[PDB]
Amino acid sequence: NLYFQSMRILVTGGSGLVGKAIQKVVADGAGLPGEDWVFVSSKDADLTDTAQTRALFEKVQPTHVIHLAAMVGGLFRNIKYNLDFWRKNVHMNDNVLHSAFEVGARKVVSCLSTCIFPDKTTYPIDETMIHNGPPHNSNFGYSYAKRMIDVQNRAYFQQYGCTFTAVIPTNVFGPHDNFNIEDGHVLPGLIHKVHLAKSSGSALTVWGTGNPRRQFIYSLDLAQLFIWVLREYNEVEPIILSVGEEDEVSIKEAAEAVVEAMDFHGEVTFDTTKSDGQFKKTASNSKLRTYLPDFRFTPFKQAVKETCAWFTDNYEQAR
Amino acid sequence: YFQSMRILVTGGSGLVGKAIQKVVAPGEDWVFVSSKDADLTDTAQTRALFEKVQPTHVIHLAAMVNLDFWRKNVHMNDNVLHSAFEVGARKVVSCLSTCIFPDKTTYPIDETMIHNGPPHNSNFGYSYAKRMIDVQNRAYFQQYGCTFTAVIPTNVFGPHDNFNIEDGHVLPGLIHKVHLAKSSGSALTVWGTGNPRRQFIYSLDLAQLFIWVLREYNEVEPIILSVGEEDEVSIKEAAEAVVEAMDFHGEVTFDTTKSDGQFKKTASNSKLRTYLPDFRFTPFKQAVKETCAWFTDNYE
Numbered sequence: 108n109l110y111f112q113s114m115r116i117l118v119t120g121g122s123g124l125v126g127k128a129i130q131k132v133v134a135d136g137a138g139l140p141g142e143d144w145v146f147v148s149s150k151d152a153d154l155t156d157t158a159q160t161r162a163l164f165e166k167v168q169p170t171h172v173i174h175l176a177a178m179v180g181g182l183f184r185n186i187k188y189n190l191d192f193w194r195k196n197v198h199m200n201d202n203v204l205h206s207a208f209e210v211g212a213r214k215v216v217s218c219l220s221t222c223i224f225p226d227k228t229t230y231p232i233d234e235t236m237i238h239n240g241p242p243h244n245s246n247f248g249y250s251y252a253k254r255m256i257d258v259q260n261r262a263y264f265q266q267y268g269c270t271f272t273a274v275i276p277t278n279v280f281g282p283h284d285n286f287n288i289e290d291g292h293v294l295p296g297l298i299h300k301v302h303l304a305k306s307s308g309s310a311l312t313v314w315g316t317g318n319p320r321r322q323f324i325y326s327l328d329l330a331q332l333f334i335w336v337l338r339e340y341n342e343v344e345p346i347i348l349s350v351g352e353e354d355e356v357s358i359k360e361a362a363e364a365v366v367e368a369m370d371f372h373g374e375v376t377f378d379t380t381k382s383d384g385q386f387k388k389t390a391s392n393s394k395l396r397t398y399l400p401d402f403r404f405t406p407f408k409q410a411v412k413e414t415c416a417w418f419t420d421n422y423e424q425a426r
Numbered sequence: 427y428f429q430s431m432r433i434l435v436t437g438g439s440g441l442v443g444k445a446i447q448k449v450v451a452p453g454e455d456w457v458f459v460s461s462k463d464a465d466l467t468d469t470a471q472t473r474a475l476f477e478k479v480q481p482t483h484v485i486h487l488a489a490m491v492n493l494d495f496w497r498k499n500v501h502m503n504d505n506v507l508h509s510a511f512e513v514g515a516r517k518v519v520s521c522l523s524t525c526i527f528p529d530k531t532t533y534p535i536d537e538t539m540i541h542n543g544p545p546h547n548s549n550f551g552y553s554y555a556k557r558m559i560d561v562q563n564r565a566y567f568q569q570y571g572c573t574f575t576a577v578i579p580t581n582v583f584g585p586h587d588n589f590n591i592e593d594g595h596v597l598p599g600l601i602h603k604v605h606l607a608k609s610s611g612s613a614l615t616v617w618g619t620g621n622p623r624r625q626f627i628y629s630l631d632l633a634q635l636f637i638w639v640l641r642e643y644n645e646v647e648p649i650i651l652s653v654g655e656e657d658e659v660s661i662k663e664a665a666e667a668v669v670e671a672m673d674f675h676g677e678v679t680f681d682t683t684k685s686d687g688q689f690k691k692t693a694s695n696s697k698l699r700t701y702l703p704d705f706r707f708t709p710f711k712q713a714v715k716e717t718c719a720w721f722t723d724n725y726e
């Protein structure tokens with residue numbers, strides 16, 4: 108008898124929007140034979156605590172790690188607490204990457220954000236420009252915390268030859284998202300706002316001007332890409348997992364898709380008192396398209412309708 | 427009639443540490459700690475030192491000088507800045523470096539360019555660890571209105587330096603190398619070509635500036651504590667000052683096999699000169715002679 112060792116994939120923050128997305132895709136036929144997929148949350152172990160993190164990694168001895176856990180929040184949450192967003196995430200990313208390493212994990216794929224890119228820059232922004240200037244002053248604590256993941260990934264590789272990498276998704280949306288009207292992101296935040304407005308018979312209030320351009324990525328698409336990165340992408344440099352620069356949409360265009368999907372025919376107003384954040388974050392998927400040129404993304408408006416459908420179908424259980 | 431102060435100096439057993447000790451020597455208690463006092467990488471040991479010595483002001487000089495350099499310094503700077511904050515410290519002045527500046531850049535490098543590109547690949551772990559002090563300083567201020575700042579000195583030299591002929595800097599290494607060469611009757615061997623340019627700052631001058639920053643500089647953005655861009659000296663010029671100070675008339679050779687490192691790090695003291703325009707620095711050659719004098723007077 109001759110027997111080959113199985114792969115143990117530990118997904119940190121597996122209860123989240125991206126976490127639950129990867130769960131669905133792996134079950135829907137992405138998991139290969141032998142592979143054991145372990146999806147954990149805060150209840151499992153508080154990743155800010157070093158002792159709790161080292162215990163989870165010594166118990167579940169992973170060969171592969173997908174680092175999705177983080178102190179996440181939308182523009183109106185992360186701009187209020189830049190010290191907490193910095194400290195907690197640096198603590199978390201340190202604990203996860205080091206515990207993975209000392210438990211002998213072969214690969215670690217962490218999740219970055221398009222807010223890591225510099226404020227004053229040229230467009231489209233590629234993977235080389237991640238450190239070419241400071242990020243936007245609003246959420247710099249969270250931005251620099253995610254930037255330092257790449258610094259760690261390059262540091263582990265130069266000192267130990269570690270295949271620790273990262274991915275840069277755009278604005279993620281989809282089922283099992285945080286639909287809080289204050290803590291959530293733009294798309295989940297509006298999906299709740301239209302739901303309440305359609306129920307109460309009230310008008311829709313979109314925060315900011317409504318002009319900032321954003322690239323949106325469906326959670327189930329990102330999950331498909333995330334699984335591929337873990338199984339084939341062996342570069343230390345991160346990869347931008349995003350839809351084309353030509354497939355960019357405005358906040359007003361996104362708000363219109365949410366109004367269309369939920370069949371809302373009330374008033375739509377823009378609260379210009381609220382911050383608009385960054386006007387453009389336009390990312391280049393040129394590196395992604397050299398690897399997967401025939402990968403087809405879910406159409407924005409169809410994906411929005413499905414996210415709106417899931418939220419109506421599952422509301423009592425939703426966030 | 428003067429308000430009480432408790433200035434905690436982390437890493438007071440170093441070159442800059444001992445410099446601040448000398449310059450300080452009204453109603454302000456100066457506490458100089460070492461690695462023996464507390465291990466600043468350990469959170470429990472750091473929180474204990476800050477709860478015992480309850481400081482109103484903190485001068486963060488301690489540091490470890492690629493994964494280890496990054497992790498240890500981030501751990502240290504986190505433990506010190508957080509413990510200071512939760513012990514209600516009014517001001518924290520940390521010590522950055524010129525290695526934080528980007529590799530591919532324009533010269534002179536000002537305080538705005540600290541994040542305008544990646545640092546040199548050689549010591550990036552350390553460079554990024556010191557960069558994130560500024561990120562923390564700005565983060566504590568936006569969330570709590572904390573007056574946590576940092577300073578960027580150039581190449582520091584002076585008494586109580588590390589004069590190791592392998593671990594030390596250019597001037598301490600050249601000071602020990604000339605001492606041994608003058609004693610043994612041997613020739614002097616200077617690493618690299620001898621042409622790389624550096625800005626040198628006397629430890630006692632930096633100490634004088636450090637004390638002023640703590641008492642008057644209330645900006646979150648760091649300040650470059652350096653001599654003028656026109657007062658930049660080459661390593662051959664620096665090696666000549668050491669030779670002239672120790673009265674060495676032997677052979678001086680340059681080991682080209684050894685690395686010359688970064689040719690220029692040219693910093694701009696434009697911000698410092700807007701604050702202290704009449705601050706006079708110790709002349710390089712006089713400061714070199716005094717460092718050489720101290721080393722001969724105190725060798726054991």
Ligand SMILES: NC(=O)c1ccc[n+]([C@@H]2O[C@H](COP(=O)([O-])OP(=O)(O)OC[C@H]3O[C@@H](n4cnc5c(N)ncnc54)[C@H](OP(=O)(O)O)[C@@H]3O)[C@@H](O)[C@H]2O)c1
Pocket residue numbers: 119120121122123124125126147148149150152153154155174175176177178179218219220221276277278279280283284285292
């Ligand atoms: N959503 C977007 O638009 C977007 C865009 C770009 C990048 N990202 C990246 O997406 C990742 C997070 O996924 P998400 O956006 O779907 O967020 P999410 O729904 O809020 O879920 C985040 C996950 O992190 C876990 N977590 C948070 N704090 C933790 C702690 N102290 N200890 C252990 N686990 C902890 C959560 O567990 P519990 O529920 O148990 O606390 C949860 O499973 C992050 O790496 C973020 O940078 C998101």
Ligand SMILES: NC(=O)c1ccc[n+]([C@@H]2O[C@H](COP(=O)([O-])OP(=O)(O)OC[C@H]3O[C@@H](n4cnc5c(N)ncnc54)[C@H](OP(=O)(O)O)[C@@H]3O)[C@@H](O)[C@H]2O)c1
Pocket residue numbers: 436437438439440441442443459460461462464465466467487488489490491521522523524579580581582583587588595
């Ligand atoms: N020297 C230069 O040319 C130069 C140039 C640019 C910037 N700087 C900056 O200046 C700062 C101070 O440098 P320096 O000249 O004073 O160097 P130094 O002589 O090597 O002093 C380092 C100090 O840090 C303390 N320390 C180190 N690790 C510690 C730990 N784990 N726990 C507690 N204390 C610890 C040491 O105490 P122990 O002795 O007890 O171990 C010592 O007092 C550094 O952060 C450096 O980046 C210096």
Ligand SMILES: Nc1nc2c(ncn2[C@@H]2O[C@H](COP(=O)(O)OP(=O)(O)O)[C@@H](O)[C@H]2O)c(=O)[nH]1
Pocket residue numbers: 180181182183222278288291292293294296297300312313314315316317319321358381382383384385
């Ligand atoms: N989070 C959130 N953003 C909104 C909302 N309404 C409009 N926006 C706009 O959406 C953007 C913030 O969304 P988010 O996913 O947090 O982030 P960004 O890409 O970091 O700006 C800003 O341009 C806001 O003006 C809302 O209800 N919630």
Ligand SMILES: Nc1nc2c(ncn2[C@@H]2O[C@H](COP(=O)(O)OP(=O)(O)O)[C@@H](O)[C@H]2O)c(=O)[nH]1
Pocket residue numbers: 581591593594595596597599600603615616617618622624661684685686687688
């Ligand atoms: N440390 C050290 N540097 C030397 C010596 N001789 C020449 N150098 C050169 O001095 C330059 C600056 O050295 P140093 O003070 O260590 O530091 P830097 O500013 O960190 O590069 C480099 O180009 C070295 O090659 C020596 O004996 N020790």
